[PDB]
Amino acid sequence: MDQKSSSPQPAAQAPETKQAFPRKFVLAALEQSSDDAGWANLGNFGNYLNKLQPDFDSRLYGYKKLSDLVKARTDLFVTEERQVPGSTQKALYLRAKLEHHHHHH
Numbered sequence: 001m002d003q004k005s006s007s008p009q010p011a012a013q014a015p016e017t018k019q020a021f022p023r024k025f026v027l028a029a030l031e032q033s034s035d036d037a038g039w040a041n042l043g044n045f046g047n048y049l050n051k052l053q054p055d056f057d058s059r060l061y062g063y064k065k066l067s068d069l070v071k072a073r074t075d076l077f078v079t080e081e082r083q084v085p086g087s088t089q090k091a092l093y094l095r096a097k098l099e100h101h102h103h104h105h
Contacts, residue, residue, distance in 0.1 A: 002081035019060040025053045027096045039093035070094055
């Protein structure tokens with residue numbers, strides 16, 4: 001529940017560290033850090049994720065923080081800002097992006 005904004009992002013920067021995304025461990029932490037409805041709060045996600053993968057660092061991918069990594073790589077992760085009941089600020093909730101059964105003929 002947020003403002004669906006986007007950005008071209010000019011690739012004028014010199015290519016820094018390129019690392020692969022290990023999604024099995026990350027999604028494993030994500031789902032375990034999720035509430036009953038299947039949404040994980042950014043804070044708890046960044047916490048439980050590091051428990052499974054301490055080697056997983058955002059600067060290895062070129063991002064300022066894990067938060068920016070997730071909202072950028074929405075292909076792997078589903079991102080929404082959700083309002084917390086009784087709180088003044090909204091919290092970023094995350095969940096796993098999965099395919100759908102596709103076939104040939």
